[PDB]
Design a protein around this ligand. Structure first.
Ligand SMILES: Cc1cc2nc3c(=O)[nH]c(=O)nc-3n(C[C@H](O)[C@H](O)[C@H](O)COP(=O)(O)O)c2cc1C
Ligand SMILES: Cc1cc2nc3c(=O)[nH]c(=O)nc-3n(C[C@H](O)[C@H](O)[C@H](O)COP(=O)(O)O)c2cc1C
Ligand SMILES: Cc1cc2nc3c(=O)[nH]c(=O)nc-3n(C[C@H](O)[C@H](O)[C@H](O)COP(=O)(O)O)c2cc1C
Ligand SMILES: Cc1cc2nc3c(=O)[nH]c(=O)nc-3n(C[C@H](O)[C@H](O)[C@H](O)COP(=O)(O)O)c2cc1C
Ligand SMILES: O=C(O)Cc1ccccc1
Ligand SMILES: O=C(O)Cc1ccccc1
Ligand SMILES: O=C(O)Cc1ccccc1
Ligand SMILES: O=C(O)Cc1ccccc1
Lengths: 330, 330, 330, 330
């Protein structure tokens, strides 16, 4: 289980860095709710279906992925291990999972993309529409296959663990893509007009924002409260997911994140209608604990857990898993 | 109470064997939910009815049973006591309760059936349609009166207690019926075509699978998440039971299992519409603690608890108990 | 508060007697649910109403009572104090609260009634229709003003505290009215035909049993699960009360019991539609702790708490309190 | 966070005074429910809106306030610090927040009003309609801009912490406005006829009392259970707020109080429809801990938390925050 890795990472990382990773904003209400919400979801499995060729593969944004999952954008991964983003990206490539390269990556995006695999690029909107679009163009020129535009960070949430810790970036970690302003719908349009890559808006929670994202020409959204790190009291994405999937009615891919910690959790998200999930903190636990081989082992365990869960639920494909029904417990 | 027995069994059994017995898959969410779900159910008892002739008997699959209960299939019972299945089967016979002989029994099915009583036989689908049907034919020739086809095990769930324990069958426990593949609806048909015994599909949770089971010629189903040992996050059977009973509308017997630990719990399952229940772990606690006489004492306590509960609720018969209403609490 | 008294009684009483008093049947699910259910109820108070003449009085079964409350039937009160029922009955009389004399009283019913006040008499149905009716006639001849026919005890619930304790009546406590069989609707009719007193059926939880009680000529019912001492898993009366009040639509008085521990709890029961409440265990705590003066002090504290709660909620009368709305919390 | 201040105040204040401040009535059910209720509310934030000019200002009762918040009436503030109400009022003025001067203030209302800022005056109805109206006239002559008529205190709730503590006002704290009777709707009319200031009824929880308040010519209400200090078991205001806002349909300002402990909580109240909130206990923690500068720091932290929350939720104005949707969690 992914629970094994969390303790291993707690042991190795400096306390303040473990807190930067684990923490949420405010009283951590949304952080805790991400888990509570998943725990309340029960799947109604189907029996006696053909499982001779169970596959966890999906096609997303033009490409085959080995699982309905990608590595979430997590800034400054050298905080957790000296190889940082390169270790994660290599493991992701080898697992057939898309890796999201961050605007605030601690290794340059061009170096990360050179690893190969299916890199996506996460955008934070800069000060200058021109620099933002340069970053997009860099990503595209480097072979990234989607732009994950983070839209829930007009500014950063108040992380009281960091404030209490007086936590700051070590001098040996930098924003390697560099030598910020709130995004609007106009910024989305500027991005969409300047790339042929799918634009994916990350941090959508309202139904009318999901519909507007489709109208705006997004190729996907990530239904997300940013891992409980942005508005404290924001609803978990998993609680809005079903309503959002019904509202877009196939008009874009609908991803979800927040608290996904097992293959069963992936199955739950799928059954609620998600195209795929992102996974954040667990990938960093595996990185901290054992570098590249740590993340590879995590991804292999997830792969096995997702296949197991699907077959136990009577699903030979992710599409079938999306047609599962659920029941909320207490 | 059945709680007495659990500690007695914890004291006598080797830790790893107690864990094989107690554990569920994954994070044990479905294991815990089986109990939570029962605990939330309240019965609305009726008063002032004639109780001069209260009976707990039912007719099921051709035969009278003393209680609306059978012993669930539990593999490898010599793990818990040296007399294993023979001790349980004798106690069951003497109590007038059906005993389910397992495909993976640690005493041969013919020896268990020779004990007498009302044996049923649980089938796991083998590799070879021909060997599966041989096992069915053996059971029928031995006098088993129903085939309990387990349909929730295309493969085994990941039991993290066993994995952590590195638990494996002792060399002194074997699958005595021997000298596996996923089941499908085609396998059900092959069984149904080859026996005149009622075929009971164990591990149904979806309403449309219950209806299809009727259409397929099943004589019953067991609404079950396999004691929380198969898909972690599968809904408890008790949560689907009422919906399933309404959907089959008398077309087959509808049994339930998972967490039944008292006569009051039997009453709750009955009031939700179950024809009968299966009981698993408590029977093995009694076996571990005191062998045959242990299981006899358990069954006598259950019998007394079921009669007590029925009469306190104004029910002179199990049919009347099925007409009780319930209310969900928090 | 009534919480003060509970510890005082725990200190003075022998453990096994405190357990006889405190305990419920089975796993004590219904015992705990009585409290949970009250705790979930919130009152919506009204403001700015005339409170110049707030009164807690009600008319019930022909007579004025000082509060919408009576002392519940509790058998064998000499278990708790040497003066037993006489101490409780005197305090009740002095407080203007009806006292329920038990069939299993440890002082004869005629002695208790001689105390004066507003005694009611609780009936358990005997073996012999003739002896049952004699007991009723005795009660009526002694000046009791209602027959509280307990209808939830075809036999006694399994009290595992008592069983574990091997608890039995001390030799110095006897059933003083003596020198039992399940009740039916026919028994109710026999009682109703033989007395002009109001017949009150205690232990009704199903709506159709409440309606039938009206049809049967009951002058009241007590919506009750017998303090969690009868069917373990029976719904709390407070959860059925609103539905029952709507169903009888003024055809009899509807009382409730189970867990009433404050004037606020009385207000909650009133707001849900109860005519009055019974209070059991707290009266015995006060008796154990301080005899007659103990029960008087309890009743004075309740009186003050009920007036306080009513006025804070804008109710000058109990009728107004019945028109309060409520909201369920979590 | 406001949690920092609570411990600081616990350290400095005498135990019995900390209890006078913290406590509620009865079993403190309503006190705890105020927090529970807020914790169950999740906001659905909006993204990608223009936040170039985020403002937390509102217009209320004729005047601009810097935040959608006022300092609640809290009697006898010299209990917490020697400068008492003057320290709080100065900080409030400097923060641009209305300060509610109490009828039971420990510094005279004219001295508090001389501080300047936006003082409101809270009225308790006196014995004598003439003295009540004198107090109103004093407040108006001193420059108070609204009368906050407390309508939930026909008398004081039973504060068991105070009773247990034998707590009484120190001899060095007095009701400085002096040298009481239950309010009715007639008292509201007498106030409304005698002032041109907006009359705000504090302690409304029933929908029909909110509508009647509008009909009566109130310029606002405060939906409130008096911080859990009046009826124990009264619903939290936050649970009635949405229903009340829909019922008045713009006919008066609708404020709420009870448990507001962060800017996120203000956002939640706004999203449920509140015009503004009151904050009580936290202001007294800050006063106790650090006098005037303590309250100033609290108000600055709240201001920053409210702006943060609004912008993270896509709201450039409080009006926009009122149009946010919410979802209840568990
Ligand atoms: C340490 C940390 C840094 C993050 N950095 C970013 C970021 O730069 N961009 C972004 O869009 N999301 C960022 N996220 C949020 C994740 O992409 C994701 O939404 C969240 O972590 C998912 O929740 P999970 O960690 O519970 O799986 C970060 C998350 C964490 C924990
Ligand atoms: C140790 C163990 C072994 C089991 N073996 C089998 C099996 O061979 N076949 C099967 O259909 N169910 C099997 N089950 C599941 C039970 O038949 C039953 O569904 C479950 O135990 C009921 O839950 P309960 O144990 O809470 O009463 C097993 C259960 C346990 C605990
Ligand atoms: C020790 C004990 C003895 C009781 N004896 C009787 C009885 O003889 N007849 C009866 O109708 N109810 C009996 N009751 C139940 C009470 O009348 C009442 O329904 C229950 O105690 C109410 O719950 P409360 O104790 O929570 O207030 C008894 C209750 C207790 C605790
Ligand atoms: C110590 C104390 C004294 C109070 N005095 C008054 C008062 O004189 N008048 C009034 O209307 N409310 C009074 N209140 C209630 C507050 O105005 C407010 O409704 C409540 O404190 C809001 O809850 P909060 O403290 O959780 O923020 C008092 C509250 C406390 C804690
Ligand atoms: O997006 C986040 O929660 C992580 C982050 C951390 C530090 C600086 C920018 C972003
Ligand atoms: O069916 C089960 O949960 C029990 C089982 C244990 C070991 C091997 C097969 C089946
Ligand atoms: O009615 C009850 O719960 C109390 C009781 C105790 C002992 C004998 C008869 C009745
Ligand atoms: O209104 C309140 O809860 C506080 C109060 C305390 C003491 C006296 C009057 C009012």
């Amino acid at each position: 289980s992914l629970a094994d890795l969390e303790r291993a990472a707690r042991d190795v990382l400096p306390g303040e860095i473990f807190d930067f990773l684990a923490g949420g904003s405010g009283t951590e209400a949304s952080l805790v709710a991400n888990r509570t919400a998943l725990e309340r979801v029960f799947v109604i499995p189907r029996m006696l279906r053909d499982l001779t060729d169970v596959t966890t593969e999906i096609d997303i944004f033009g490409r085959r992925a080995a699982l309905p999952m990608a590595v979430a954008p997590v800034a400054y991964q050298r905080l957790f291990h000296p190889e940082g983003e390169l270790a994660v990206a290599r493991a992701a490539r080898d697992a057939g999972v898309p890796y999201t390269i961050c605007t605030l990556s601690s290794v340059s995006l061009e170096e990360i993309a050179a690893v190969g695999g299916r890199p996506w690029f996460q955008l934070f909107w800069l000060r200058d529409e021109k620099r933002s679009l340069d970053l997009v163009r860099r990503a595209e020129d480097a072979g990234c296959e989607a732009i994950v535009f983070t839209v829930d960070v007009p500014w950063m949430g108040r992380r009281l663990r960091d404030m209490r810790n007086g936590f700051a970036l070590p001098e040996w970690v930098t924003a390697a893509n560099f030598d910020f302003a709130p995004a609007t719908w106009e910024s989305v349009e500027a991005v969409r007009a300047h790339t042929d890559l799918p634009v994916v808006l990350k941090g959508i929670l309202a139904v009318e924002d999901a519909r507007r994202a489709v109208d705006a020409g997004a190729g996907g959204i990530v239904v997300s409260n940013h891992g409980g790190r942005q508005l404290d009291g924001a609803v978990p994405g998993i609680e809005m997911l079903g309503e959002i999937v019904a509202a877009v009615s196939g008009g874009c891919e609908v991803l979800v994140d927040g608290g996904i910690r097992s293959g069963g959790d992936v199955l739950k998200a799928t059954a609620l209608g998600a195209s795929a999930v992102l996974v954040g903190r667990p990938v960093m636990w595996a990185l901290a604990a054992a570098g590249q081989d740590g993340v590879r082992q995590l991804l292999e365990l997830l792969a096995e857990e997702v296949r197991d869960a699907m077959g136990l639920a009577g699903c030979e494909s992710v599409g079938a898993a999306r047609r599962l029904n659920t029941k909320l417990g207490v």
